[PDB]
Design a protein around this motif. Structure first.
Motif, mmCIF file in Angstrom:
data_model
loop_
_atom_site.group_PDB
_atom_site.id
_atom_site.type_symbol
_atom_site.label_atom_id
_atom_site.label_comp_id
_atom_site.label_asym_id
_atom_site.label_seq_id
_atom_site.Cartn_x
_atom_site.Cartn_y
_atom_site.Cartn_z
ATOM 1 N N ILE A 117 -18.435 -2.330 1.742
ATOM 2 C CA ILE A 117 -17.487 -1.809 0.763
ATOM 3 C C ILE A 117 -16.144 -2.487 0.984
ATOM 4 O O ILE A 117 -15.677 -2.594 2.125
ATOM 5 C CB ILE A 117 -17.351 -0.279 0.863
ATOM 6 C CG1 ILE A 117 -18.672 0.394 0.479
ATOM 7 C CG2 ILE A 117 -16.187 0.223 0.013
ATOM 8 C CD1 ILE A 117 -18.811 0.661 -1.005
ATOM 9 N N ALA A 118 -15.526 -2.939 -0.104
ATOM 10 C CA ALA A 118 -14.229 -3.593 -0.064
ATOM 11 C C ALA A 118 -13.183 -2.739 -0.772
ATOM 12 O O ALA A 118 -13.459 -2.104 -1.796
ATOM 13 C CB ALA A 118 -14.297 -4.984 -0.705
ATOM 14 N N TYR A 119 -11.971 -2.745 -0.219
ATOM 15 C CA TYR A 119 -10.871 -1.927 -0.707
ATOM 16 C C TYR A 119 -9.655 -2.802 -0.987
ATOM 17 O O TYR A 119 -9.459 -3.842 -0.352
ATOM 18 C CB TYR A 119 -10.513 -0.839 0.313
ATOM 19 C CG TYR A 119 -9.961 0.425 -0.293
ATOM 20 C CD1 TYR A 119 -8.597 0.682 -0.280
ATOM 21 C CD2 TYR A 119 -10.800 1.363 -0.878
ATOM 22 C CE1 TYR A 119 -8.083 1.839 -0.832
ATOM 23 C CE2 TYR A 119 -10.297 2.522 -1.434
ATOM 24 C CZ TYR A 119 -8.937 2.755 -1.408
ATOM 25 O OH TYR A 119 -8.426 3.908 -1.956
ATOM 26 N N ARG A 120 -8.830 -2.363 -1.939
ATOM 27 C CA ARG A 120 -7.631 -3.098 -2.330
ATOM 28 C C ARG A 120 -6.728 -2.250 -3.218
ATOM 29 O O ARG A 120 -7.190 -1.702 -4.224
ATOM 30 C CB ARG A 120 -8.012 -4.387 -3.060
ATOM 31 C CG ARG A 120 -6.850 -5.068 -3.750
ATOM 32 C CD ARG A 120 -7.058 -5.158 -5.255
ATOM 33 N NE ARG A 120 -6.941 -3.866 -5.926
ATOM 34 C CZ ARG A 120 -5.796 -3.359 -6.373
ATOM 35 N NH1 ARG A 120 -4.666 -4.030 -6.205
ATOM 36 N NH2 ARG A 120 -5.779 -2.181 -6.981
ATOM 37 N N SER A 121 -5.450 -2.136 -2.863
ATOM 38 C CA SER A 121 -4.492 -1.415 -3.692
ATOM 39 C C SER A 121 -3.090 -1.828 -3.273
ATOM 40 O O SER A 121 -2.899 -2.533 -2.278
ATOM 41 C CB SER A 121 -4.679 0.103 -3.583
ATOM 42 O OG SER A 121 -3.460 0.793 -3.793
ATOM 43 N N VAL A 147 -13.352 -1.747 -4.428
ATOM 44 C CA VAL A 147 -12.734 -0.563 -5.010
ATOM 45 C C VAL A 147 -11.227 -0.776 -5.069
ATOM 46 O O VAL A 147 -10.656 -1.514 -4.261
ATOM 47 C CB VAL A 147 -13.088 0.708 -4.203
ATOM 48 C CG1 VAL A 147 -12.720 1.964 -4.971
ATOM 49 C CG2 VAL A 147 -14.570 0.712 -3.850
ATOM 50 N N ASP A 148 -10.579 -0.121 -6.035
ATOM 51 C CA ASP A 148 -9.153 -0.321 -6.261
ATOM 52 C C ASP A 148 -8.342 0.966 -6.138
ATOM 53 O O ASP A 148 -8.757 1.919 -5.468
ATOM 54 C CB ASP A 148 -8.922 -0.959 -7.632
ATOM 55 C CG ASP A 148 -9.644 -2.279 -7.779
ATOM 56 O OD1 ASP A 148 -10.535 -2.382 -8.649
ATOM 57 O OD2 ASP A 148 -9.331 -3.214 -7.010
ATOM 58 N N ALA A 149 -7.182 0.996 -6.781
ATOM 59 C CA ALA A 149 -6.211 2.066 -6.589
ATOM 60 C C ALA A 149 -6.664 3.336 -7.311
ATOM 61 O O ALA A 149 -7.810 3.466 -7.750
ATOM 62 C CB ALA A 149 -4.834 1.608 -7.058
ATOM 63 N N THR A 150 -5.737 4.287 -7.440
ATOM 64 C CA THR A 150 -5.989 5.591 -8.054
ATOM 65 C C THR A 150 -7.120 6.338 -7.355
ATOM 66 O O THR A 150 -6.905 7.404 -6.775
ATOM 67 C CB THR A 150 -6.322 5.463 -9.555
#
Length: 168
Positions: A16-20, A165-168
């Motif tokens: 899983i990848a994350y970014r915001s 996955v991104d923000a919010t």
């Protein structure tokens, strides 16, 4: 957000990848078990988020920028994955590879530009038979196929190696 990544990993998601924008999201996605953290924009503040995440214990750091002068400096500060976003990109990734980059990544919403990137690569996909580009690249022999933002649940069953996955 945490309830959404719980069901993905409860499904067959192993990466899983994350970014915001808020690094607090990066900072707390690392406690939730986030496999890979993406960093996006100011250059100085970006390399600040790299040195700390490495000390926070992040196992996989990713940096993304259009200027390949900026992706070489993140390599030294702790960036493990370089995300290139252009006809010189094949040469741009050539310098980075021959400078120590073991994991590069190209991102686009067209598999034509991603097959061209097959010449360590990650084939990031932007999306909007929609999420069916994985079965292609997989048949072309892609080893790391990532997916970025409901199709996330579907692209897992299709065979997406990494989810973003991104923000919010």
């Amino acid at each position: 957000a945490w309830k959404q990544v719980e069901i993905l990993r409860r499904l067959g998601a192993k990466q899983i990848a994350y970014r915001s924008d808020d690094w607090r999201d990066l900072q707390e996605a690392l406690k939730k078990g986030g496999d890979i953290l993406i960093v996006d924009t100011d250059k100085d503040e970006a390399w600040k988020q790299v040195e700390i995440l490495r000390r926070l214990g992040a196992k996989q750091i990713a940096y993304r920028s259009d200027d390949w002068r900026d992706l070489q400096e993140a390599l030294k500060k702790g960036g493990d994955i370089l995300i290139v976003d252009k006809d010189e990109a094949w040469k741009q990734v050539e310098i980075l590879r021959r400078l120590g980059a073991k994991q590069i990544a190209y991102r686009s919403d067209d598999w034509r530009d991603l097959q061209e990137a097959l010449k360590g690569d990650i084939l990031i996909v932007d999306a909007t038979e929609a999420w069916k580009q994985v079965e292609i690249l997989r048949r072309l022999g892609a080893k790391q196929i990532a997916y970025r933002s409901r199709d996330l649940q579907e692209a897992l069953k299709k065979g997406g190696d990494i989810l973003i996955v991104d923000a919010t």
